[PDB]
Design a protein around this ligand. Structure first.
Ligand code: HEM
Ligand code: HEM
Ligand SMILES: Cc1cc(N)nc(C[C@@H]2CNC[C@@H]2OCCNCCc2cccc(F)c2)c1
Ligand SMILES: Cc1cc(N)nc(C[C@@H]2CNC[C@@H]2OCCNCCc2cccc(F)c2)c1
Ligand SMILES: C[C@H](O)[C@H](O)[C@H]1CNc2nc(N)[nH]c(=O)c2N1
Ligand SMILES: C[C@H](O)[C@H](O)[C@H]1CNc2nc(N)[nH]c(=O)c2N1
Ligand SMILES: [Zn+2]
Lengths: 407, 411
């Protein structure tokens, strides 16, 4: 029932009681652990609504009050007659902040309660979506002093009227396969980049082409839109000591803004719900630049540091990886754009765990995702036992709509 | 029912059917994953099925499943069990047994090596002194003057669990750590408690940053007794850096032979509570963990100082810079002295070919992602991008409590 988590660096032991209020399934059984797998009705809706509203009213310390009780009735009546219901603004804001609070894969949740919510449930068209998004981008960016935000489009209905942002992030770079055989730009977005061009995007066909947005309103065929270039804050990448570094022509964008997820609040499904905070340095320096499936630039970088690339045991990949990441951090900082390093992020996430443990009775955390893709054991989270479980409200991965929609 | 794992870098999808032969539990449920938790006397009743399972396995793999030879051995073990309540493994079974425990060790990146394991059978051992000598020979053979070879020594199985063979050291070779009256430890901090226990049994401690602790050995459930590994048997590598000449002046060395002595080898239901095993190091075990954990030698501060890194903001990645140099030094030192070591790139790459081969020939390979991915440079090693299934197969190595917590003293 009660379960302990031990930190093996500090010996601090925490007791998790929050898991018993756990809802969905993990993918694991008594027989098999799936911790490292990336993807493991009126009757159905009311329990979900009730469960959500009970946590809301308890959170505002009016559990069992008439204000509480009255609301449970109204939602039930609306379900029985309308087949869905609408969240109050208070509920929407609480629902959103908690979906982030419950995201077991996010190292940055110390911040969870500072989420600016933009209610875009009155949106009806893709142009409308584009407007709400540009406003999201500008508010969030704040000329480099980034602030967390999420924008919530209308909730699923019969499911054929879904609002969706097709891009996986508001801001990402194109990818083109070349007659050469290699790939120009980001090969993560190759498919999506063709889909855009296959819908009349004049792609400048470069390495760092900011992609156009594909907005789907009300289950309609989606449309292209170019984020005002002045709204996309980008950072040229230089090193505090390697002068030649800029000659690689590396740039990255300041705003990570995840837009392919599904927000579930009290049984309601918000299928377009882009949110954004700010980067941990390693997301760009380690993953975006150094993954083989990505910009994959280690080979070329080590070659400029004059490192011995003849044997893996010289650790040249490792030397170059550090420098690449020093440079990302330095570049963003020089330009006063919010970024956080993995030491500082993970340190803040331990403080946030301890808070969640005494304050909430626990904190679902996915260790595989929380530990940075560099220097794991020199970050405090490496030594921290974490329990992983699915609470609601939540964000959930949804598959690329192009796999789904018809025209 | 088949399960698939994806490699997110290569898009290679594998199909695991071996998880179907798993019986033991994981600590996980449909409602909780305990994937990151470190730790999540047997009756005749339960024993024969475990024997039977095991021997069905052995005979399958030698291609004798169903043979008169297989049925005879089942019957013979059967009888032996109800007559004497336990049973003895044949040699061929013991060897098969201990290879498979390593094979099934899901937290072990070194398994491409599994079929090459030198089993020493120490099941005629009866005293601690007997234990010392078996172990000395283990260490000599395994070392092989720096050209390390994998080995395990198996002392007698548990009986009533009142007569256990134990090695009190968690590794056969490990440095002392001595807590000072001011809170600083002198030496490796992981071994403070064991160090004191040794000191208590009358070991006279040199008290330096690198003293090789004595073996504490328990035979037949008896109290244990001290013993010095002969120093000429203990291969050590002083740590220097290829370009940094001041690195040697930090006075660091490490031992060559990693030899886990605190685990339990279960084969066909039998429990071998002393089965020290040894292989060779992946460099990061020393360079990242042993040296750079805060709870270990903690040399980061000292190394980065000497390198003149900017130490006033963590965002200089000074800590990350110093970590790499230390790891370069470890691999450099070991190669220079011709002591076997493998780097984390080479090791994870081998594990991937191993894993892939293990799906092809065995229908799977249990693997614990959290332990397999190295504790530095995770994503630039290919295991990071590897989906893994973790499950428990027997034979197996199990953790067991430190015995001073359990052992009842005779005095
Ligand atoms: C404020 C700074 C933030 C930091 C530093 C941060 C950090 C991260 C990181 C490092 C990851 C995994 C990254 C990856 O490799 O893909 C992640 C995942 C995630 N984060 Fe955050 N986060 C922040 C803000 C937010 C916000 C505002 C939300 C939503 C309100 C959020 C929700 C999520 C979710 C749902 C995931 C899992 C994504 C997936 O499955 O692909 N985070 N976070
Ligand atoms: C060929 C040399 C080997 C290499 C490079 C290697 C690699 C490793 C590493 C790096 C670990 C985890 C290290 C740690 O953090 O404690 C490990 C764990 C383990 N290995 Fe190996 N291994 C090797 C040989 C062996 C052998 C010969 C056996 C048994 C015959 C074995 C069985 C195990 C077991 C049971 C664990 C888990 C230990 C625990 O849970 O504390 N390995 N392996
Ligand atoms: C297949 C699949 C499943 C899943 N759940 N997720 C993905 C996105 C991939 C995975 N891992 C990297 C990449 O996502 C790209 C990075 N995501 C940014 C997370 C972040 C950081 C700071 C602030 C934020 F608002 C958000 C793919
Ligand atoms: C509590 C607990 C449970 C468990 N299963 N294990 C431990 C040992 C920890 C793991 N990490 C630090 C320390 O183990 C240090 C010893 N690990 C060497 C593994 C190895 C490498 C190469 C060849 C070999 F034969 C063996 C503690
Ligand atoms: C297969 C494995 O689960 C996969 O590569 C994971 C590992 N940990 C991760 N961790 C984070 N933060 N982001 C990721 O994309 C991944 N990928
Ligand atoms: C809490 C966490 O499970 C623990 O610190 C683990 C993580 N992964 C590890 N991986 C290896 N190889 N060795 C370890 O000691 C650990 N420690
Ligand atoms: Zn699990």
């Amino acid at each position: 029932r009660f379960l302990k988590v031990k930190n093996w660096e500090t010996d601090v032991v925490l007791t998790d009681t929050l898991h018993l209020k756990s809802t969905l399934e993990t993918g694991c059984t008594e027989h098999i652990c799936m911790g490292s797998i990336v993807l493991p009705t009126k009757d159905q809706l009311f329990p979900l609504a009730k469960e959500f509203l009970d946590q809301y009213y308890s959170s505002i310390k009016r559990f069992g009050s008439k204000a509480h009780m009255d609301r449970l009735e109204e939602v039930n009546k609306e379900i029985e007659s309308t087949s869905t219901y609408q969240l109050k603004d208070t509920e929407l804001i609480y629902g959103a902040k908690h979906a982030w609070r419950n995201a077991s894969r996010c190292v940055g949740r110390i911040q969870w309660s500072k989420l600016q919510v933009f209610d875009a449930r009155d949106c009806t068209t893709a142009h409308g979506m584009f407007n709400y998004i540009c406003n999201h981008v500008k508010y969030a960016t704040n000329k480099g002093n980034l602030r967390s935000a999420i924008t919530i489009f209308p909730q699923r209905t019969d499911g054929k009227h879904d609002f969706r942002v097709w891009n996986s992030q508001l801001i990402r770079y194109a990818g083109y396969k070349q007659p050469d055989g290699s790939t120009l730009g980001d090969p993560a977005n190759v498919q999506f980049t063709e889909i855009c061009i296959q819908q009349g995007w004049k792609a400048p066909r470069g390495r760092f082409d900011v992609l156009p947005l594909l907005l789907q309103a009300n289950g309609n065929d989606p449309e292209l839109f170019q984020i005002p270039p002045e709204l996309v804050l980008e950072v040229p990448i230089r090193h505090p000591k390697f002068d030649w570094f800029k000659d690689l022509g590396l740039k990255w964008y300041g705003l990570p803004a995840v837009s392919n997820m599904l927000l579930e609040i009290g049984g309601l499904e918000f299928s377009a719900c882009p949110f954004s905070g700010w980067y941990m340095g390693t997301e760009i320096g380690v993953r975006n630049y150094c993954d083989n499936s990505r910009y994959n630039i280690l080979e070329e970088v080590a070659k400029k540091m004059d490192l011995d690339m003849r044997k893996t045991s010289s650790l040249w990949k490792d030397q170059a990886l550090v420098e690449i990441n020093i440079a990302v951090l330095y570049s963003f900082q020089s330009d006063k754009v919010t970024i956080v390093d993995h030491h500082s992020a993970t340190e803040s996430f331990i403080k946030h765990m301890e808070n969640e443990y005494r304050c909430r009775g626990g904190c679902p955390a996915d260790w595989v995702w929380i530990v940075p893709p560099m220097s794991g054991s020199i970050t405090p989270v490496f030594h921290q036992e974490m329990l992983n479980y699915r609470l609601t409200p939540s964000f959930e991965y949804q598959p690329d709509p192009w796999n789904t929609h018809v025209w």
